[PDB]
Design a protein around this ligand. Structure first.
Ligand code: U3I
Ligand code: ZN
Ligand code: ZN
Lengths: 797, 26, 321
């Protein structure tokens, strides 16, 4: 069909942060990369002052500020995931604020294997070139000798193929890169002198070797010291010619360091953070000589405290540090000199909906509006977010453990949430907890006793009963050892009137790759106590469960089973359907069943009640990673696939021969730019366009998909083409290229979709421009016609 | 004798006994 | 692009890409798979001349190259478009965190270990908590993991090295396993139609984990042997292509114990494929279809004393109920 996608909530996860002088030479700015959004702040003695927030037609993969020789203020370089590079500049002409594009280009090469270590963008400290590591064995060099508006570049052959991290070195005669590469002999450190005239690499200043087997970070030490700091798994080494220092503090071996940032401009203090959310201070002791040569004396590491698991880290000024996080809330932390007992004291926290791994729409106030409850965060950042509309109101319920799945039960006036807590194998013999989480502070705990069947961390799965008003952990039922709860549904089955909490689990042992045994446990929670009302043991993993017309439709590995609810309150195997694919995604509408595995194998089944079994209708098998699926109507199916794409396939209309009706022809292709995890039929308003489907992403972005008539689609499509002419692209990136279906092998234009974000931006353009996009546009038409239809398109979120 | 099957090498002592085996190959 | 390629006018077996195959005799051609809409490009190259003084026997051989889907035939010539190899990126590359991008290359394994794959899973599929699926589910779609799982079962059949013997490229590893499994003609055709190597590896593992029983293709239900009895006596694996005195090719799977068979005649040693073993034709006890031969050791020191060699074309893998 024809669909319309609009961003209801901007991506909230921070993936990049830099400090510089972007707005003016006298301002200390803090730039934040939020996937497609770029936020500009100015650091004040009080905190952060918002300046400008722009939206790019790309996924910001690189973001670095730099000051070329002869520039009044800093310049910004951004490289998108689609290899759109651009150089930007802040312009404030009176009261108008505009981000202009100085240079722009697509630094993509048709040949080349994208390195497993991702895109790396480094700039020479003396601002001579922009080094890019996009593909293995190739080092793109964009010279910055001014007037390079098209961003012309040239590649240099890299003898080393597996490059972990690369940065430019300070205080050198010629541009010098420092990188860590992996070979059969292990991980090493090497340096190359870049010569832009000969367009080749030259022998670097120092060539050491055998660094830590898990060395993963290179830090360029400023001019006073020079050289590079190589942060590994358990050792921090300093390399600068013949001056080799290596400290292995036991405080850091406990976790892996994942972010670093320079504090003072001379590189004396460093701020490193690990996966567990701890903040460190790398103090490199110095020693000056009689001729003034400052030589590094020692390397110190001091644990400052605990932040909200840092993705990026940046020091602002006067103790204040911005902690950008993808897993949890970003925050501002003050670094006090005295221990409070933790030198880290919070200042201001910013909500982060991402990652959203499951959600549900509930109209608690019975007003048809609807509150969105989402499983957000992970590990100690696990939380429950309630989003209700007009602005967005967000309730943050911290769980301190990973929430996985969620569903709602109205009769019990509470939510059921599948979650997981990480305990550590203590020496006595059990599993001690890491921190008190939701599964540990419940009002009443219980364990499973079905009995139907040394130091490493192990997952502990619990079913949570969370009140719909106070969000209190009323119950916390712990599942069996080595049992992984995968499915959770709440419904009434058969003729029974009671509403049950049904959980599908899998018995996963590290030695057995494919699970051959699982459980479908039926619970009842209402009477204030959680007791088990019979369970059905299956021979595989229960990936998905749904309520199928009074019965229970489950997915056991490669089998879609239909269970009945007998008078004795037990599940009875009615009929089965065995597939060649693993039944991961299970969605139903009426008597139709939508099946899907992780590889975009779209299967369609229908329950034939006259016989009692299902029959396959159509299928569409195209190898590609698939993250979510949803039924639009009886002959249209939505899905999210690699890379950051949305797609719609339909049941063929010209069904004359049995070979055409057995195929789901793909009709919709769209590059969303986000990774959808959950699809939810619902709405956040209290209601033209048919259908309303919400989805949650890894970056926290929540969007909406709605269907359109062919007449309405062609109308908005022509308007979408004309809005592109009048709306400025931040990096001069073409919208159709940004929304073009992007995969590693194929690249196709966007079809069957309309970008609601672009359509809604029509109301923000000047009146003359409105009369320009309506020139020769008819369902002629006036500007006042479109202003009344786009305003209605805003009345859906 | 040369009344053996060329496909598997089964030795039959009659001309007819081998023609019956020839059917078991197709 | 497409190609104008000739057709092999006398081909019976379907050739897998990367499979060498002697042929029954009565520079790139097409070998169709008649059920009839698919095929594979084979390369007849052999000018082989073995040297036994005065007699230089000339053996002919073909090797599979590319897959294709037939468009139309014209007598024999065939215009056909080559089916591409669908190579997919890592499952976590979509959701890989930029901070974890640097810590994505893993040091190598001390080849002998079983606990190494535990840390391999924690690292490679760490960002699975950002998605709605567990760590172990993504391992079921990891080509490198699938290859080791297949290699584990193949080492139980053949007692040969684990190094360069098996290719590391998954698209080559998948095609290699397809030409080694003792599977019937329709299963080989079904694997050729598969585009993704990950799907091919997943199904080859499914065939090994489900289709344990091997039965007569003619009479369907008649268990001849199981996967447990499979072993390798010929240094070139448990199933190697042999040619009889008259030029018939037999992909003979060697098993320890086979059942439900009838022996025709007395043991003979003429042209025995396994030196020191007396072959005797074996037939199905229900439909009398030729399933293979029984080899008995002439001397008493040989080990094993008795074993069976079943031709691949006469077998049908089935899933026990
Ligand atoms: C050269 C003498 N010859 C030719 C003229 C007719 C009489 C005579 C017959 C007996 O010849 C044969 C015809 C077919 C087969 C075999 C010999 C042996 N054999 C397989 C058996 C298993 C094995 O281990 N190796 C094999 O080769 C056959 O399929
Ligand atoms: Zn015969
Ligand atoms: Zn038989």
């Amino acid at each position: 069909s024809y669909n319309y996608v609009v961003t209801a909530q901007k991506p909230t996860a921070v993936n990049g942060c830099v400090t510089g002088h972007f707005t003016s030479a006298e301002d200390l700015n803090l730039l934040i990369a939020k996937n497609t959004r770029l936020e500009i702040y100015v650091v004040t003695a009080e905190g952060l002052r918002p300046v400008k927030e722009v939206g790019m037609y790309g996924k910001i993969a690189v973001m670095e500020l730099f000051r070329p020789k002869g520039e009044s203020k800093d310049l910004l370089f951004i490289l998108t995931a689609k290899y759109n590079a651009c150089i930007l500049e802040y312009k404030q002409s009176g009261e108008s604020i505009d981000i202009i594009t100085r240079a722009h280009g697509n630094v993509q090469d048709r040949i080349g294997r994208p390195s497993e270590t991702g895109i790396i963008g480094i700039i020479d400290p003396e601002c001579r070139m922009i080094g890019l590591r996009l593909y293995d064995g190739l080092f793109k060099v964009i010279p910055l000798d001014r007037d390079n508006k098209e961003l012309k570049a040239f590649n240099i052959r890299l003898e080393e193929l597996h490059v972990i991290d690369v940065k430019f070195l300070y205080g050198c005669q010629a541009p010098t890169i420092c990188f860590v590469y992996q070979d059969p002999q292990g991980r090493h450190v090497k340096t190359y002198e870049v010569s832009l005239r000969e367009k080749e690499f030259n022998k670097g200043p120092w060539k050491q070797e055998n660094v830590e087997a898990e060395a993963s970070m290179v830090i360029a030490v400023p001019e006073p010291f020079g050289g590079a700091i190589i942060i590994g798994q358990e050792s921090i080494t300093y390399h600068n010619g013949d001056k080799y220092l290596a400290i292995a503090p036991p405080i850091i071996k406990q976790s892996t360091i994942v972010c670093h940032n320079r504090v003072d401009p001379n590189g004396s203090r460093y701020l490193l953070g690990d996966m567990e959310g701890r903040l460190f201070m790398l103090l490199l002791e110095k020693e000056e000589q009689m001729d003034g040569t400052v030589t590094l004396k020692d390397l110190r590491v001091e644990l400052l405290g605990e932040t909200s698991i840092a993705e990026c880290l940046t020091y602002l000024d006067n103790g204040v540090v911005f902690v950008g996080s993808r897993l949890g809330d970003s925050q501002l932390v003050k670094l006090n000199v005295d221990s409070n007992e933790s030198y880290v004291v919070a200042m201001e926290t910013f909500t982060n909906l991402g990652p959203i791994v499951d959600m549900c729409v509930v109209d608690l106030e019975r007003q048809g509006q609807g509150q969105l409850v989402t499983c957000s965060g992970a590990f100690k950042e696990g939380s429950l977010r309630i989003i209700r509309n007009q602005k967005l109101h967000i309730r943050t319920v911290p769980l301190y453990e990973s929430p996985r799945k969620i569903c709602y039960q109205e009769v019990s006036q509470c939510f059921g949430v599948l979650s997981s807590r990480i305990e550590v194998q203590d020496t006595s013999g059990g599993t001690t907890a890491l921190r008190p989480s939701a599964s540990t502070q419940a009002l009443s705990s219980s364990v499973s006793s079905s009995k139907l069947f040394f130091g490493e961390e192990v997952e502990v799965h619990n079913l949570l009963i969370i009140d719909q008003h106070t969000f209190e952990v009323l119950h916390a039922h712990q599942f069996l050892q080595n049992e992984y709860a995968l499915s959770l549904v709440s419904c009434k089955l058969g003729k029974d009137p009671n509403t049950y909490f049904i959980v599908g689990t899998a018995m996963v042992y590290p030695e057995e790759a494919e699970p051959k045994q699982g459980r479908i446990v039926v619970f009842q929670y209402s009477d204030g106590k959680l007791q088990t009302v019979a369970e059905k043991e299956v021979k595989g993993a229960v990936y998905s469960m749904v309520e199928f017309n009074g019965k229970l439709l489950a997915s056991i590995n490669s089998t879609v089973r239909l269970y009945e609810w007998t008078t004795e309150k037990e599940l009875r195997t009615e009929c089965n359907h065995y597939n060649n694919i693993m039944a991961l995604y299970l969605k139903t509408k009426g008597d139709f069943i939508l099946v899907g595995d992780l590889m975009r194998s779209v299967l369609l089944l229908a329950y034939k009640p006259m016989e009692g079994n299902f029959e396959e209708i159509a299928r569409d098998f195209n190898p590609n990673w698939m993250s979510a699926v949803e039924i639009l109507d009886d002959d249209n199916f939505l899905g999210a696939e690699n890379a950051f794409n949305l797609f719609v396939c339909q049941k063929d209309s010209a069904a004359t021969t049995d070979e055409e009706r057995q195929h789901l022809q793909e009709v919709g292709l769209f590059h969303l730019g986000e990774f959808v995890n959950v699809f939810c039929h619902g709405s956040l308003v209290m209601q033209p366009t048919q259908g309303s489907v919400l989805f949650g992403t890894v970056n926290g972005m929540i969007g909406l998909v709605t269907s359109l008539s062919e007449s309405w689609y062609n109308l908005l499509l022509d308007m979408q083409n004309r809005l592109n002419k009048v709306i400025k692209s931040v990096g001069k990136i073409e919208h159709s290229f940004w929304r073009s279906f992007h995969t590693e092998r194929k690249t196709e234009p966007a079809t069957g979709f309309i970008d609601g974000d672009l359509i809604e931006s029509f109301l923000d353009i000047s009146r003359p421009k409105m009369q320009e996009v309506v020139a020769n546009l008819q369902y002629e038409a006036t500007a006042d016609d479109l202003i009344k239809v786009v305003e209605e398109l805003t009345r859906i979120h | 004798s040369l009344t053996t099957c060329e496909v598997c090498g089964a030795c039959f002592e009659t001309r007819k006994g081998l023609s019956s085996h020839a059917r078991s190959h197709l | 692009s497409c190609q104008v390629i000739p057709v092999l006018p006398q081909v019976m077996m379907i050739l897998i890409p990367g499979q060498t195959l002697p042929l029954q005799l009565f520079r790139t051609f097409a070998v169709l798979a008649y059920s009839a809409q698919f095929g594979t490009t084979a390369e007849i190259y052999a000018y082989r001349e073995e040297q036994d003084f005065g007699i230089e026997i000339v053996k002919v051989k073909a090797i599979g190259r590319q897959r294709f889907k037939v468009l139309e035939l014209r007598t024999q010539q065939a215009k056909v478009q080559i089916l591409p190899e669908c190579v997919l990126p890592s499952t976590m590359s979509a959701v890989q965190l930029e901070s974890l991008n640097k810590c994505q290359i893993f040091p190598s394994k001390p080849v002998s270990s079983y606990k190494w794959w535990q840390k391999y899973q924690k690292r490679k599929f760490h960002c699975a908590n950002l998605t709605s699926w567990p760590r172990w589910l993504y391992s079921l779609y990891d080509a490198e993991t699938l290859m080791d799982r297949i290699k584990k079962q193949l080492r139980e059949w053949d007692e040969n090295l684990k190094d360069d013997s098996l290719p590391s490229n998954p698209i080559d590893f998948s095609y290699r396993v397809a030409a080694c499994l003792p599977i019937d003609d329709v299963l080989r055709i079904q694997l050729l139609k598969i585009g993704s190597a990950i799907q091919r590896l997943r199904c080859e593992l499914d065939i090994m984990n489900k289709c344990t029983s091997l039965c007569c293709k003619q009479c369907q239900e008649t268990e001849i042997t199981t996967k447990n009895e499979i072993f390798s006596l010929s240094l070139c694996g448990p199933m190697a292509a042999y040619v009889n005195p008259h030029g018939y090719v037999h992909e003979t799977l060697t098993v320890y114990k086979a059942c439900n068979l009838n022996l025709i005649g007395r043991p003979s040693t003429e042209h025995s494929w396994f030196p020191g073993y007396a072959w005797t034709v074996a037939q199905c006890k229900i439909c009398a279809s030729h399933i293979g031969w029984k080899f008995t050791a002439t001397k008493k020191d040989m080990s094993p004393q008795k074993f069976w060699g079943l031709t691949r074309s006469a077998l049908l893998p089935t899933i026990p109920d």
